Symmetry: D2
Subunit: 364 residues, 4 copies
């Protein structure tokens, strides 16, 4: 482990892992410190949906950043593979955001003004996905909201960053950041390092660093538990989605099913009531899933923030320090764009003022 780097990334999740990749692409000698194993926390609990549309509320800049990030996923799997040997496992089936009420229809039809987003009548859906619940008023088919396996998207980025110089240190918790002197100074139980730039990408745990650097930005964990089953009997190509819950078909024959939302809960293991809730919900969307064999059950801590938006930007009082945390429900989707934006702020290139202002560290 060297003693000085031009840039150091604190966090081995998909965010920090992506940032490390883009920096090493800029040939910027950089290192990354992960308290545990790469993509070992929230990142490996994610479904992997590139849900720019499905998670759309309004038409602000957040949505544009997301759409931008979604474009970035084009070919990215090939890029990282040729450098890692790790397949991100992309599935282009698309998504069916289901409607079970008139209110659901009103909400889904607000995307009529967008491409690759078309409305399907109940019969049109059941013709493509015969086993989707028959209680549907129809669904919105989002062709681009496809999916990938987050754990491998992360491992791909990391393995690729290494083959580009990046030095990755696991089981190396960063304990403190000293912005004193003329260069930044980080301390770990394995040693202390110097850098010209420090990027906080510790997910929901990032608060500690903000505080350390005088900032007050807080994070709230939003626990989500899921399960998977083996779908050996019915066909299911498109991802079924409804009210923040989903059933995504993996290329392995497994269906990733989930999401409870438990604010303030820091535990990372599923509770009985949580899984029961997911099982109950999934049956209303895919009745046949009740006969499928259960596989695994897990949980993750979504990095929540006061306004639901992430913090992606320079420290107000010190541009040498940056932050990329609080991607709540879209960390996987927004990785490519978050990485590029941080790498572009370090390389001091020109960046979209709207996005940069949208995610600024000092918000009302």
């Amino acid at each position: 482990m060297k003693r000085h780097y031009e840039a150091v990334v604190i966090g081995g999740g998909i965010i920090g892992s992506a940032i490390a990749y883009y920096l090493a692409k800029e040939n910027k000698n950089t290192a990354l410190f992960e308290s545990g194993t790469m993509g070992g926390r929230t990142t490996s609990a994610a479904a992997g949906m590139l849900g720019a549309h499905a998670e759309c509320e309004e038409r602000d800049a957040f949505f544009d950043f997301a759409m931008h990030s979604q474009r970035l996923y084009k070919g990215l799997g090939e890029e990282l593979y040729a450098l890692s040997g790790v397949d991100i496992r992309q599935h282009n089936g698309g998504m069916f955001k289901l409607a079970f009420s008139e209110e659901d229809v009103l909400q889904l039809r607000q995307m009529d003004d967008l491409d690759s987003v078309s409305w399907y009548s109940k019969e049109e859906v059941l013709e493509k996905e015969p086993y989707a619940s028959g209680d549907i008023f129809g669904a919105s088919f989002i062709q681009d909201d496809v999916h990938v396996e987050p754990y491998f998207v992360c491992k791909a980025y990391v393995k690729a960053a290494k083959m580009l110089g990046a030095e990755i240190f696991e089981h190396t918790p960063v304990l403190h950041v000293e912005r004193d002197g003329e260069a930044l100074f980080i301390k770990t139980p394995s040693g202390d390092v110097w850098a010209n730039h420090v990027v906080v990408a510790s997910g929901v745990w990032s608060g500690m660093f903000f505080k350390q650097l005088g900032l007050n930005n807080a994070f709230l964990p939003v626990k989500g538990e899921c399960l998977s089953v083996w779908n050996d009997d019915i066909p299911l190509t498109k991802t079924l989605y409804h009210d923040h819950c989903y059933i995504v078909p993996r290329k392995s024959g497994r269906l990733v099913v989930g999401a409870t939302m438990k604010p303030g809960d820091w535990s990372e293991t599923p509770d009985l009531g949580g899984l029961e809730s997911v099982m109950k919900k999934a049956k209303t969307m895919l009745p046949p899933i009740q006969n499928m064999k259960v596989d695994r059950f897990w949980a993750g801590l979504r990095p929540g923030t006061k306004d639901g938006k992430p913090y992606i930007g320079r420290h107000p009082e010190d541009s040498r320090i940056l932050f990329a945390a609080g991607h709540f429900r879209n960390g996987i989707l927004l990785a490519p764009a978050t990485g590029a934006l941080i790498s572009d702020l370090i390389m001091n290139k020109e960046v979209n003022q709207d996005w940069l202002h949208a995610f600024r560290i000092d918000r009302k």
Copy 2:
């Protein structure tokens, strides 16, 4: 593997495993053939309740055999331990068979005429188990219906039988039984053996042998799925039981929760709807369980028979062949008594004519 044995046991579950023990106790040179690993099937899916009372319907001989078998469990754990080093993990907390309706009360109060079976008012129960549902009309406390870990009761018997001569062969499926010649003849992919006595203890799979020996006795699988959670917050000493479902506290801090009843289903892995059903049921009995961390989920095939009673006895046309299969819901409880009875029929001792007639192979 020898070529001749005075007695051969076909089945390594808890039944065959117990029979092998008692025979080797009689110093009868015997061997056992298990298609897979010992106690690897239904036996290791069982909760381990010695439910002679809880599974009581009427007051026939079946119930007496059960009560007898329950007595046999006295000290048995010590006996087998001193010979195996394997602890059966016995828990003497007792059982609370809960009542949620007047009909439940009427049914439970029919045991008033028995010792170690007392009625508890709602308040008396909540005083002993504060977290049991408050919707109860009270419960029947069955002091003797305690529990053990079946897998280890089985391993204990087997390990003990070995230290007594018994020769145990795993991964040795018995393919056929020839009662021709003057001695029995069994065939396995690993060889053929001769014996003076053959005992069929293949659980729900025993049908094949009955047929082979001209008998028509059929078996129906009754699949049951369960799960376990970690109870790190509340006290729970007594086993909560209701309508064939239960919550049994293990000495490890885990709660074994279960039982769906799926007739005709031969699959041994839980389906999503099954577990959801168990989770839902358990919450009505122990509301707090919903906050507990899930551990594992599994399933087993209860050996079902036409009249709900097992077949424990000699082949009508050949006393050299015996059967001990179809213990449906009480295989763990009835092992000690089933073993002793079979070993007593081989050693040609005198046995209870009622039990012997109750479980005869040729029934109406």
Copy 3:
């Protein structure tokens, strides 16, 4: 479960699965009976190498078959994906059959005259695979001996078959095959069925059927123990092969390592001595593997025949009954060719008489 099928396949490993698929494709009312779960035995333990050049020490019928089957894999992945939604995870890195002595070189050079196969020097190997043992005398590069994940290619076959109308019955052991009427009669615990064609594809457990049908063909299990690790640090694109042992890099970042050769052992879980043995071997081939984190360990029973060759074809005295078992170390590779052969025979089409004679059921 119907009462009559044109064809009944007994066994659901990759072989029976492939067979069921091709029959479904030929539009034949077909059913497959699997004792447990599809691909749950030997198939799930295999590395998945299409090692057609491990059977070229003599360019006979066997080698032509292996080569032909290897050819059939071109495009098979896409074909099955379209119908299954399951990715077989094919990796085209190729293979480096390492040499650690002159004799090794002499032996390995003998296949230089083969197409897509060429020799590399100790320094030309290290140029591609820098971390390969520095004690090698070079290696033969086999471009076409790529690899897939056996379990998924099996599940893809089965799923594709289901979509084409094949009826798959898991947890349905076939107990006995009867021939008396103008058709066959199969017996399972879940009822009986009639067919015009029965195909025995029970892997190493096929013996009982051969014996049931008058043949004495024997099967001997040859246990193989393996392990896997995570290769997060060094590059490895080619599979390293030596003395039947190997290191195959999967697209997940895992290295599948192995195989012990234990004749007559029917246990399916690895023992300590065997794993130590595999670890030791792997280290001689890829020194760095010593610092890699262990993932999993497992074992499987290669189905061995007296001559180590499969029995693929009709029953000598009944062309309604076919066999397809005993693929020692090449079950995965030969899956396509074996399935096409059995399917074509049942369709009574024209077939290479050399192969048909090479796999005769009654070999001297």
Copy 4:
């Protein structure tokens, strides 16, 4: 989570757990903050030997402490069961410290003058343990160096503590300990708390607190890798010990084997080289283990200090702050004595000055 507690224990491994229990027993409004789950780190990796005679190469204060702690285990199981419902799984077989050379004998004989410790000859050992290596020169029998299952004794302490009023907070990392008011101030992501006594028991991660409080005591992880097997065939009642390596027979039928010694490695999962190493060692001590089925593999970080001795006591410049970390290879054994010591110090009772000086925080 309240705002003020008399005592706050930081760390939930067996040490902090024990401490929390004794304080609860002394009726002290106490809270314990565990970063993840109770006993989820090093504690869960330990074998659980009460090896008090591994620290007698010099009968000093350390040995007296070890002996005293070993004494405290008498009855501890029952005491914690009564309150927890958790069995600690104590096994009293004793230990055979094997000798493979004359020097081994010379060294091991030196403790013959100790009570309950006696020497056995190569033939007297094989009389008790027939399968012990035939290459031994005999062994020392330590009757009191029995074993328990670390995880459960930890969970028993915690549960017993909860019943006595201790408030345990999992998934609650303590970020910083502040001293300024008349009391201490602990900071967690889930809020802040005040206390009159803080006890640092974070195992190998304790360094950051020492440093936060002005001390420079360092911790170095010494990774230990292990594995387990099923011993279904041979008898083994005594634990086999040699050169810090061991084979402990558990009451489940498992053999816990191990320990590699890897200084400075913070990874918590075993690597291939380390496991091969452990397997090789075990085979020299118990040849038959070679044919046993592998169960699991795991690792843990022994918390190492400059002198391999724990830091147990008050902060040199603030008696409100205590430490209890760095129990290299004896954390389990010393759990009772360490907990009683810290509890008594907080209760400001009389304490053995020799031990208090042996574990001083500022050792030259």
